[PDB]
Amino acid sequence: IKAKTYPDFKEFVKDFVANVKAGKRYDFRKYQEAVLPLTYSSPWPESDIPEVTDFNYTPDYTVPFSEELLYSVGAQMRTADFFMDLQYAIINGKDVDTVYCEWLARVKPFSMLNAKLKDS
Amino acid sequence: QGFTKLGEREPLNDIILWEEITPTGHSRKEYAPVASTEYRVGEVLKADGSKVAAGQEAQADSVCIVNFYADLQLSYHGQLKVVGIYRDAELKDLLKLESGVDAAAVKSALKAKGIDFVPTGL
Amino acid sequence: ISLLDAVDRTSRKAETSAPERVRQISFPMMYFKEVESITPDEIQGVRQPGTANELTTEAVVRAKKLMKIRTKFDITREFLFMQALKGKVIDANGVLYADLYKQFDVTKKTIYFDLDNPNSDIDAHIEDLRMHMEDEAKTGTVINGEEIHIVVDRTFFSKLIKHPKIRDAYLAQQTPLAWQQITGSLRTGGTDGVQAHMNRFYYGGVVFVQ
Amino acid sequence: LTNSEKSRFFLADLTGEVQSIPNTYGYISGLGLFRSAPQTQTTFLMDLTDWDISLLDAVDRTSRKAETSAPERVRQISFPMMYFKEVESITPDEIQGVRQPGTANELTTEAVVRAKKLMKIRTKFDITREFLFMQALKGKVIDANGVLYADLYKQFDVTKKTIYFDLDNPNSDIDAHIEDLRMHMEDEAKTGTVINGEEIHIVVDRTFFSKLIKHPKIRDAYLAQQTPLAWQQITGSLRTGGTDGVQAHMNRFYYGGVVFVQYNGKFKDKRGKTHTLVSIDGVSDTNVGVGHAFPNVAMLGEANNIFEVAYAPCPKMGYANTLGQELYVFEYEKDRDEGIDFEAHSYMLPYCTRPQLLVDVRSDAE
Amino acid sequence: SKLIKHPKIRDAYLAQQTPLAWQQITGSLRTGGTDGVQAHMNRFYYGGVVFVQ
Amino acid sequence: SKLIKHPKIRDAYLAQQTPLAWQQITGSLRTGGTDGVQAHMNRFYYGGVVFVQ
Amino acid sequence: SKLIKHPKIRDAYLAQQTPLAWQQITGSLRTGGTDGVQAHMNRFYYGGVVFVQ
């Protein structure tokens, strides 16, 4: 994912899930501040997000909260953790319909991001 | 149930705006009320004393300015007659017309008879 | 009322105004009563609880029973007031006494906040509430929409506090001094009978009270 | 104490009376924009003079040749004015027997009926004046019926300016459109003085305001702020100012050097069609927002005021050739004690002497 | 430990500029008290309630 | 317009919390003398230089 | 040029609110130091060291 290729977050996450569906996996929880631009209306990503080949992520909680929600409405988690938990859902067979980012205000360490999930 | 509705006030005789004021009743006619027929202010009457029906607006005769109740032979002022303005005068545009009655036709007939209608606001 | 139309000055034409409408309305009211009796058998030989050998007094029993009657009437009056604030004035037994919406021939307004939808529009619904307060009140005077008691229950309050649109906005709001609404106690005023301070939340100029 | 329902022999109580006064809007009237200009004659003229400037072309010295400048241009225009007349009558048969609402068994008098009739007439004239002022602000003075009385753009030979904000597109430059609107007034004022384009009034409707305050650029800009203004605009009451006809506080929003006020004024005519004050004649797509930007009073100064309203005397038997008035009310009694007649007159025209400064604003893209 | 580690609790103080937030996110968190074995009991503030370990 | 719109400049200024930062972004701008027709002229401060429109 | 715009350094200086970060994020980087041609020479502070162009 090359830097500043997508003019907003909505079009960024549209091809982030598509890349994950294609077998591409990402991990940036250690250098999170270097890849997320501030404000969701800024071009995404701030810097190029490299691919990884050793993606082995097993979270300590049930990532699919309901059958149609990644987190309970109002749950706050680290922004880098949102992408990992989202990637966990696509791997296990859940499809992403809409990523909830309309009224969100923060991208850095903690953000209230959510996704509406679907089968297949 | 919890909503007794007592009812609603009948329209008042305020449609008169100007009439040829005379010692007797100028532009004012008395009708013998038609049996089992209820009159209100603003309805258009025929020569006999019946409301103008669809297809015969050319013979509109007057505009009723009384509230006659058919069930007790009397009116709202206790007068046992129906009074309507037939000759020259001007009225508010508050007319009660039956189903299928063409307003333009009765307006033209009344204008020919001398009655003019002032455009009233909503 | 309507809008005047321009008229030729020389022709001397004019306009007119339609008359008003008058209706009448009736209300029945509800009557309830309570009876109690004092007999010289609940004060004869019975000791006052909490004391070793102290007998109870007729005045004590009288005051206790009168206080219980008064507080029972107080709580039922509070329940009836809350019922009236909801439009339909029904009893505890469930018998309807006055349906204001059918009585005045209006339609109940309901704002669906959709607090379970993360991309919902809280500001839009609050503005709808204010607009319904201002427009629908036909008093003919200047009206202020932000003068409403929004009394809610624990479920609605809890779902409203943690909505992403509100919580993220308040979290990003640094140095607001109103960090209390995020970190501090929400028991910031008011009191009902049993609770010293009641939950209340400030957002959009209105207060949500639980 | 009045007769109970179902029985003429038992009694009930008549506690009171509830009234539903219609909503009335007076924001433009209360703005004080249109200064009063009482008039004696039925028409007033106006002189329009202007000149133009150009750049000198270099001409050689030895061949003594020069340039010249075109003379001025002086024109003249005239204005007709609208006449409003409203008649109302009181008759004994709407007083005799009729019962006063809200009272058990007391009867209506002539005084209460006369007072309510006069109040309704004055309110009607006030809302008509507000609608006329808003129409004049739009640049075209169209009567409620629809007849044209003074098209300011053709009279002064100017073209209307409209700006498409394109609020739907998340990548739209709100700053660019705001700057364009700001510089249009300075460029097209042509008063010969120094113009400050930031002193303007931007009045928009509900949809335009909603789309503007929810734009991703504006909200993301104000969210990353630690000023009291941003805190109020994001999590706070968006209802500063106000004293509107209906609401006590109008919605307004500060983004640049300008403010956006949401005006909900609307009226109905006799035909029943509604007349939204903040609207564009033609557009009705429901999903597009419209607005009207006009110069502030303190932009061209008090010496050059462009918002004036004229008033000329009614055609009565003793008011000829006198200064105009806001409203005339006349008392006439019917002969033979048959009633009382009322007449209300108002002969006015609101106009703008610099129609180019009246700029329209839309929310969709061109 | 589980309470102070929870993402909601940590986030409520991470984005706060109060000295209390600074002390509870970065500082000692062993505010005061003495249980007889340690010089300062560790306490946490998340509203009107104080969590004492 | 394109210079003040640019995401790099806007985001570099959107973090600074200083009256200048509050003034350049979502502010009046228009900080300058007259040119003959307008009271003030657009002026943008960045990198030590001033862009004057 | 590569160093001053590195995401780690740039986002470490963006998040802090001090006159130094504002000076070397949006302000002029020339600071001081003559060159014989330049009146002021580019200087950057990240750690205890200073980078001079």
Residue numbers in the entry:
A (entry chain S): 2 to 121
B (entry chain J): 4 to 125
C (entry chain F): 54 to 263
D (entry chain A): 2 to 367
E (entry chain E), F (entry chain B), G (entry chain C): 211 to 263
What does the paper say about this structure?
Bacteriophage Sf14 infects the human pathogen Shigella flexneri. Here, we report multiple high-resolution structures of the full Sf14 particle, including symmetric and asymmetric reconstructions of the virion capsid, empty capsid, portal region, tail, and baseplate. Sf14 virions have a spherical icosahedral capsid of 820 Å in diameter, which is connected to a long, contractile tail that is approximately 1205 Å long and an average of 235 Å in diameter, expanding to 315 Å at the baseplate. Overall, phage Sf14 appears to share some similarities to other model phages, but in different combinations: both λ- and T4-like decoration proteins, HK97-like capsid and portal proteins, T4/Mu-like tail fibers, a Mu-like baseplate, and a P2-like tail needle.
The capsid structure was then resolved to a higher resolution of 3.2 Å via symmetric reconstruction. Each asymmetric subunit contains nine chains of capsid protein gp34, three trimers of decoration protein gp33, and one monomer of decoration protein gp20. The decoration protein gp20 binds the capsid as a monomer, with the capsid binding domain contained in the N-terminal 118 amino acids, folded into a largely helical bundle. The core of this domain is hydrophobic, while the external surface is enriched in charged and polar residues.
